[PDB]
């Protein structure tokens, strides 16, 4: 009736979006008109029941694909009352790394994938008490028993695509109902504010369809696939000709530091990175088995990106993106990646 | 056809929103245009069997009907033209009117719980129960919030109708949500809530979902259900408001019981007896947000009041003892 | 595809409506333009085997199948020329004719109670029964009030129609409701409110809910069904009025016999010896609304017919015994 | 296998019975032969979590496992030596052994009332009611009754444990039994009820049916449910009795309140402060059966105790003030 | 017809049981008629695909095919004569063997948890959970407990087995139960527990239940999963034994890593590292029962070994380390 | 009723049993006594519809109709007096009596796998699959295992019937299993399994699951099924045995193709072209058991029949290659 929706979105002290929607008298222009807003950290998990009560402050805002019209979905991230950025905010430290190293435009593009569940806890669609057949046919399938929730997965990219995010195209995986998105490319802190939106858009829109969304690296157990959040790099110079250069540069300092890079990359992902391995580092071109993989086609032109296939699917963005720039774009005095795991 | 529809909804002698629809011959244009009415009122607790009157009061678009179809909130006036046994508005309006320039604003914070057609809670495992609280406060997933298609209708509803309505959000205890309202001035508070509920329950119709106002619709650990009153007056808007926001506090303070009376009916299951006030305190009879206290101006929040409070009572009892008293009209005594 | 559709209603041997549908070359501007038809009188009950004809009475735009397609409203005529058994609309024009003068109006309560599929009530609990009487009456919430939307459908349906519906309410039995329609002049009161019947049935059907307008549906306490007629003159609508009023109550009082032979069958499951009269009184058989009581002139409301009333056969002895007999037409000899 | 089981049956810190099953060489012949035993009683809510002892009491045939298997009433003691919190039948096995000469006798009239697995009334339309009372006293026919083949599986169960089951029968509200023991002398009432107690729960088992001894299992008309304690001394027994029966009747009146305050929580909500008495009065605190007055001896019926009510503590608070109090005892005072 | 059925039972390269049955010509009468036999140890993990033999170890009666059916426990040997990876009861054999003169006994307390044939909780809630834990232990009443009916007939089997069961509970965990197995005499323990544990999943099969020796089943607050062993030796059976028990236990203080490196997998998530001792104590990992010590001799209990622990290692490592090791085997390296 | 009823068995023209039932006047003592019968050759495809007859060939006691009831496995003859299309008892009859003197003894392992009425895998998860093999073979425990009570109710029949059924287990493929009988001698091998097979259709009738002797029930790596031949003469029954064995597999060698052409039909989707032999190995076309190697005497295992197999086909070539040709008789002449 004239007013404005803007849903407030922002990250709790478990692994999950959290939002509230309010009313606004007009509609948004920037980021600037939007107010800063606050909630009961003590029932998400970031406060304590009296140094409690946590602030939200707008860092990105996009239309509401689910409200659609003039309506729109804020981004928020989450500071205590001293003014310091929450335990579980890590959007602050990886901002600093980004910000430090402007010059480098470092550039990400993540593979999102997750795994669809009853409202039941039962992986989506699987035979009552039992399984489907065999994996095989499912990877980018087509056809009725190849493929779960095809409608969903679809709604979610018209959504991402209304927001305006960069997501890049979807694919159906390999475990039956389990499906990936990739998001990229983005810069610095939007990859982070990006796949988490998309996610918040992922979760929301299922809802609608009475599908749980999991974020978890091995939903089953056995063969089937586990689920992982691959990372693709590049900076400036990797992109220009002569690049496999710095690529190259950039995977052996990745070398050096593989385990504070696992540390990051998500929880009990030892049940995927497996034997890919947990404590192992290697890498090459073309090569789905090793930590980083040179796509053939960027060893082929001598300039491109690599791919870190080392996170897991539950990743944060903030801490994956933030150390990838910590590490190959050089630390600072002024912000340690590995440290923020308060 | 060229003809209207006006939903006419009033308050009955339970706690509990009515109505019934009559065609009028031409779109409205001023509350003056519409007529009186009445109805039954031993079908609804309010007579005795030997017929009550409606004076309309405020209306809106027909959130439901649309086109220009509207509804109208009517107050209930017995054959005297006496306020009814259970007409407050009345009463809370000469409290308004008297303090006038002291411009009370109100917002609410209306939290309910959603109920099964078999009334039980809506979309818990049936026998059982969700996961113990905590993922469901503003949640956001399959299983962390229920019913919320018919929650955002809701929203549209009271924004198509044009009420002030401020933002949702889901609480915490599974299946329990919170609209607010507000700010409004003086009786607008009431009428709008009271809106506001008929569009609740009548949305949810739609969805076969019972609305519980009860404060505690389960009994244990499970969150009760309030209706937070925040408050504000001219003075305490301006600068170095603090001051007269702490006065109002202490008036208030004294008068703990009697606005307990209104307040709502087994609050004691959701302290009752204690009075308390502080700033960023969830604990606190009375809460001052840190945002005001950093500030220096703002607002209170009455965390007393209970999801099944009537508005005109809260309201009207909050502006008596915080603006003045008058003898024209005593709010504690309305309740008849 | 050019073409129009009509669908021909009528009123057969039971108490029921019947209809089919005729492709007509044209878009209808006037009565005038639409043919006589027939039926086979014997599969409804009106004939022996040894065949009734349509006679064009009213038409209105048809709420189903919208567009220029219509609905029209059809007299049963004998062979004969004669108005069938179940014709009454004809003996009660007569009586509307010779008092063109004195303008009668009525106004109609209709009330109906709506059933299942399988005749039980209409979302009432399997094999037992919702709560007591009380929060159904103009109720509103998920469990207070049964099946709105075919409710409005109708509402809605009547409106496009035409027909002059003054509005609608939940009553008191749950899954019980009303709907009015007035005021209209004579032989409208009739036509109208059978092609609300009609527009009622057909909609519900769109729902597999069945309407009974049987005076007493559930034995025992749960409220009975009626029609309230309402009714006024010219005299009694102008200042003075309640002159003519308590004038028309009194003839009333002397024919209460003769009134409750039509007035519906089975009413004595829902006094009928008993004939008083009253301002403000939901008692009386006839009522006289506080309102027009304190005003001095408009209408009275005769309680007494039931839900399952032929309103050409209540209107038209209203006005006989109201306004004057004819040797010309005896309404309580209608019955044939 | 030549072996026997003997289930543990014990009284635990909620309202509740616990049991588990032991092994026994050879078939049992006198209490002497059963073993002391325990539990873990911060598991039951009887002890702190730094374990509580099982002295067999009472023992009987098990109706459920047959055969030369047995159920075995165990009495909770702390390690001290002295009874558990929720050990009430030590202190009035103190007043029964006092009195021994006066012979008491009681019999109690246990009502309850039967639930879903889901914790909705037994049978009763789903979300909804039965017809209102009237037909399920005493009922027979297939809507008048509900599961009385559990009810009389229990009753068999009874008898075969050679309990002193008096009678059933089916009460006023649908889905509501009551079932009588005695009469049962001292502290053999409390050991009965609780094993016919036992028995009920153990038996609705095997219908999925939950049991509820609350005094108000429906808000509303809907009845409550009492456990009736019938009581009497030798000399009310012997002619000139009324004489006895009337003094006693007359001590309880002076006791109301303390005696009210064990006989069962909530029974507020089944008069509570008043206490009265009269012959044939359904009405009084205390009845004396016409049966009784007219004969000169026999009984006296306390109507006051809720069905919820532990038996040790109205059965040991009746000796205490009909008999005479100790000073080696307080019934009262046993609240810890 | 004259022949008799013997089922073969052994242990698989997995944590279950396997079994198959043969026809015999005659009645079995003693361990020595019962012939070896042999399996696809491929089909359990026990063997490459380039073969294991059963040598019969312990017989009872069938309590499934009853009759003169018998069931045959036997043990896993390779083709070498060498008992297999998962054959454990070997070496125990000659720890038992070697301390004959001690006479350990055991007795097991046998935690299982009971599921779907979905895999979830039996008859907990659809994706919901029951009420917290409390009145689940113990329990009796129709909510409190779960499956009962299944576990009464595991009882029955045992007993017609002739197995030692000593008794039964519901545990605290809903759909949680206990069986006890005791007191057994060295090679006994294991080989009777096995059995058991054949009749529990054997006949559940019969209720569609599966059976989980999971430590913890459930995540949370809910309940663990233990087989408390129960340890005694002569000495400690006749007076001045807590002399014994105490050297017993501190023995064991001194190997608790070897100790819990057996009993059981997972149980990290049932004090893992520190070990502590005490008497009514069950928060330390031995308690030594205020009986015993009130008494002077008796046994303990030793609360670390979980649910799914093998009963051959856990009696043999516990006689290895309370009665002495031998040169002749190593329990901790039995782990092949 | 004195009566006694003779069940009919016999071996179409498909893969199947087929019977009829007569009444008989009195209990039977030898074959003798049972007439001739016949049937509708060309209801079952083994006549053209210009008539066949039944040889009684053995009786059992009927494990179904139990009492003097009793079952007549019967063989075809045309009427010709020749042995019908489907008749191959009477070909390997001739060569078991040619070699009466070396006591051909045989022993097969019948697998099968069970289906729904909708000839789906019996039990198997909607529409996908149970877990991996593995857990199944030899299971124990309700996911393990499909279908028991059908398995078990088999084998009582089979031994009431006093068939030398030797033994059962549960097969790697889900819902598969395996009963064997042995050892028979000559004929009686056949006659034996097909009335085993025609007690396990009919068992499983009551059950509603259907029978499957296929090779190769599902495709993939789910297990095939098969019966394996065990076989033996007198000679390698007595030490020195494995001479004769030797002697036996290598004159399979030689004839492998022309078994392989009988042994079963799809038999190739379960090596076909391949022949070989060794001990301890399932992989082998003959498999001679470690046990028999390592003693010298005994049997061996010819792995290629596949569960479809004619008994009376194996067995006859079996001996027809192993005992010698009779120029009276050609076993692979005989698929006519």
Redesign the interface.
Known sequence: ?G?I?AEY?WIDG?G????????LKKRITSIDQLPEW???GS???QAPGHD??IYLKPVAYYPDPF?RGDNIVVLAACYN?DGTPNKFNHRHEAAKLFAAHKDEEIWFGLEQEYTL?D????VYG????????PQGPYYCGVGAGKVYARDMIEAHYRACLYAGLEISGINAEVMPSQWEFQVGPCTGIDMGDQLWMAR?FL??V???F????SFHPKPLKGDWNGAGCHANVSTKEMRQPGGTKYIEQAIEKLSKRHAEHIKLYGSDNDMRLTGASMTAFSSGVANRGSSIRIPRSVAKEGYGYFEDRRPASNIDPYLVTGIMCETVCGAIDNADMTKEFE
């Open positions: 009736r007013r929706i979105v478990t999950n979006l959290r939002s509230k929607g309010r009313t606050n909630f009961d029932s998400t998990n409690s009560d409200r009352n569940f409202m039941y806890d039962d699987w035979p009552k008490g039992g399984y489907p057949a918040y979760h929301r299922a809802e609608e009475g599908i749980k969304i």
